[PDB]
Every structure is written in structure tokens, then in C-alpha cells.
């Protein structure tokens, strides 16, 4: 008689980023080798979180769940571009429940897992320009602040083409992401007589 | 004996833009179809513009300066990138003379050319971009703001290379070309609401 719950491993380092798409699996176990079904919630209430998908493939099927091959139940999702960002970090996240159970109605308790979220330039931190040489260190041509945003384009494939990269006066660059979170190179990395 | 000077023709209307390559002819003849070299002055002294040049190709050569083949000299530069141009923009010109020397020892007298010089925006007129249509006019996006760049850019690949655009907040675009003057795009040609359309 299986009068055993599912094992759940949450992943203990969740963190995603505002507007980009994250993704991270729930690993599960049962003795019997089935797991039924899951639930996420806020510990028994609504979930509450509409852009959050979890995919339901093979669930319910004998031998979906065993110690060598666990059910792997991948979550996707988008935080919303402009989710408040409190000035306390901690509460920069959503805590939700998991429970699963086997095919005998086994339930697991409410495992936590907690969805962290950060501003988009907490992720990036730009690499400095290959040095642009100037005319006037005070006070950058057209010319000279297009070579500086070219110069940190290539030398930051990895920022969002859709981040806009402006240049200053004296050749401090500015790294807008778009969810208006922002980095700053300053000018010493950028330029030099 | 030949006692008389070449003849030089200059262009009536040269004029240049900061910071781009220009070049223009003079064109020389002399009855004994020889011109052996010239002359740019101020009026006598020295020239004082030292990034303008010329060739001497095929000077102080047997007919190299006929009537049916005039000697053609050709004088190239580029005017300054930051050459001032005063609240009156007619007051941008350098007035200089010309003169040469035939094989015999004749030179012609001085006459005048003007180089007239202005800005980059006098030259470049661009076209509206294609329409960026964005969710807040009063308020445009990193991405809206890269999109409407683009657009711009797109629009006028004639433009320098070097010339800055840059996006306001309200879609406002500002064209600075490399010389540091500009052209503007009113945002009510550059963006529309997303949801009235
Ligand atoms: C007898 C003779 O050849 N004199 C020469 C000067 O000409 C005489 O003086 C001037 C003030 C005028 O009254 C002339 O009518 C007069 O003959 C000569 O001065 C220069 O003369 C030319 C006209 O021949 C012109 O006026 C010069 O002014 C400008 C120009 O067109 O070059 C006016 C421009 O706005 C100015 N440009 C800028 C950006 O400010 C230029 C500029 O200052 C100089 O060209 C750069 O060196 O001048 C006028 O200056 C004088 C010149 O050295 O030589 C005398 O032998
Ligand atoms: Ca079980
Ligand atoms: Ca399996
Ligand atoms: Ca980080
Ligand atoms: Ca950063
Ligand atoms: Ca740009
Ligand atoms: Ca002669
Ligand atoms: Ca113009």
C-alpha cells in the first residue's frame, strides 16, 4: 500500500528579471513511481500570479516520477515590466506554495518557493570600451560620442539591443534597459586626450 | 617674343560644407600653350588657409595649356570641421586671388575666387521617418526611442555616418551633424498613439 507523498525539490535560487523572460523546473518523486497531479497557490489561496505558465506534460502516467528519472515540470513566465520594486530587496519577490500528489491521493504538504525579482540592470554590468581617443575631454563632437556608443555596443554583445545607449558632454555613458533601470560607465573607462 | 600672361578662369559659385571633402577647377591658357606654375594669395601675401591644395601635375610641360586643352588645375580641401560661421552666414567666405607664369617670364595679375563655407544642416534636408507608433506620446520607451532613430536613419541613408540623432521624451527627434549644427523632426511627424490607431 503506497501511503507515502511526493518528494518536491523547488530550485533553491530563483531570480528573475523584470520584462525578460525566466524559466526553472520543480523536480519530483514518488515511491510509486506516478505522480497525479499539482497545485501551486498562495499557501491554499489563489496563485495570483497570471504570467506564470506551468506545463502539465506527462503527468499522471506510471513511471513518470521515479529516483533516476524525475517528473521535471517546467515553469515559464514574464514579471511585469513595471512590477514595484520595494526599497527593502526582501520583499522584491513572491512566495507561493507547491503541493503534489500520487495516484492514490497521497498529498504532499505546501512546499515554499519564492520567486525573486530585480530592476534588469542588476543582471547586466557593462565590459569597458576599447578607449576613445578625443579632441576635447570636457566637451565630446557627434563624431566622437557616436565612436564611444559604437565602442560599447561592441564591446557589450550581451545588453538588450533594445536598451538605448546615450553619451554625454565629457563621454560618460549611459545604459537605459527597458524597464528604465540603468548602468553608467564613467568617462575615465570610455576616453582619454 | 611673348610678352603676354596666361588667362585663368575661375567658378563663379564655390561653395563648401564644414568637414566635407570639396574641389573645384581653374582652367589656364597662354598663347604660347605653356604655363610653367601659379600662385594662391592674399592678394600678395601669404595664403593662410593651409588645408587647401593643389596639384602641380603637368605643370612647366610643352602645350600643356591650350586653348582646345586648357591646363586644368584642380584645387581641393576640406574647409574645417569647426570653422566659425558668424550670425550672418553670408560673412563665411574667404576671398582669395590666383595668378601664373608663362615659360617666358610673364605672370598674370591677380584675380579673385570666394570660397563661400557653411554649415552641414545646409546641405542635408531629411526626410520623415516612417511612423513609430508608441504607447504614451508624451512619454516614449528605450526601445521606442532606438525604433525611432532607426526610422530616422533608415529614411535618409545620405546623411553622414557621422552625424548624431538623437529622441526626446515626447518623439521630438534632433539630427547634429558632425559640424555641430542640426535639423529637427516635430514629434507629430514621428510618433502616433498605438491605441487611437
Ligand atoms: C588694395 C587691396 O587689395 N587691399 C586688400 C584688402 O581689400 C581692401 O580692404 C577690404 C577691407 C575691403 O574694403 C576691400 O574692398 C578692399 O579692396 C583685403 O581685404 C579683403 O578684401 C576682400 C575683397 O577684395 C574682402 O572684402 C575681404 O573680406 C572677407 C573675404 O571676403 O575674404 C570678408 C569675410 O566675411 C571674411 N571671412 C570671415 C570668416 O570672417 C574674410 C576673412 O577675414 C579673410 O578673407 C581671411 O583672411 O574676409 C577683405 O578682408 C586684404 C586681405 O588681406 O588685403 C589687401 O591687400
Ligand atoms: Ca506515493
Ligand atoms: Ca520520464
Ligand atoms: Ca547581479
Ligand atoms: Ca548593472
Ligand atoms: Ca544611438
Ligand atoms: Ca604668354
Ligand atoms: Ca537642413
Not at 510509486?32 to 505558465?53: A, C, H, R, Y
Not at 516520477?65 to 520583499?91: C, F, M
Not at 518557493?113 to 581617443?133: G, M, S
Not at 566622437?144 to 546615450?166: D, G, L, S
Request: negative net charge; proline residues 8%; aromatic residues 8%.
Amino acid at each position: 500500500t503506497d501511503t507515502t507523498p511526493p518528494t518536491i525539490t523547488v530550485p533553491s535560487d530563483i531570480i528573475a528579471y523584470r520584462g525578460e523572460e525566466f524559466e526553472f523546473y520543480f523536480e519530483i518523486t514518488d515511491d510509486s513511481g506516478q505522480v497525479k497531479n499539482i497545485e501551486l497557490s498562495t499557501f491554499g489561496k489563489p496563485l495570483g500570479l497570471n504570467w506564470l505558465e506551468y506545463s502539465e506534460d506527462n503527468f499522471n502516467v506510471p513511471g513518470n516520477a521515479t529516483s533516476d528519472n524525475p517528473l521535471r515540470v517546467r515553469v515559464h513566465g514574464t514579471v511585469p515590466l513595471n512590477e514595484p520594486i520595494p526599497a527593502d530587496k526582501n520583499r522584491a519577490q513572491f512566495t507561493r506554495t507547491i503541493r503534489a500528489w500520487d495516484a492514490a491521493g497521497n498529498v504532499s504538504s505546501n512546499i515554499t518557493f519564492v520567486i525573486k525579482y530585480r530592476a534588469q540592470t542588476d543582471k547586466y554590468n557593462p565590459a569597458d570600451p576599447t578607449i576613445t581617443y578625443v579632441d576635447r575631454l570636457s566637451s565630446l563632437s557627434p563624431s566622437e560620442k557616436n565612436a564611444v556608443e559604437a565602442a560599447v555596443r561592441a564591446a557589450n554583445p550581451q545588453i538588450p539591443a533594445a536598451a538605448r545607449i546615450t553619451v554625454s558632454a565629457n563621454g560618460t555613458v549611459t545604459i537605459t534597459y527597458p524597464d528604465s533601470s540603468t548602468d553608467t560607465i564613467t568617462a575615465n573607462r570610455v576616453v582619454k586626450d
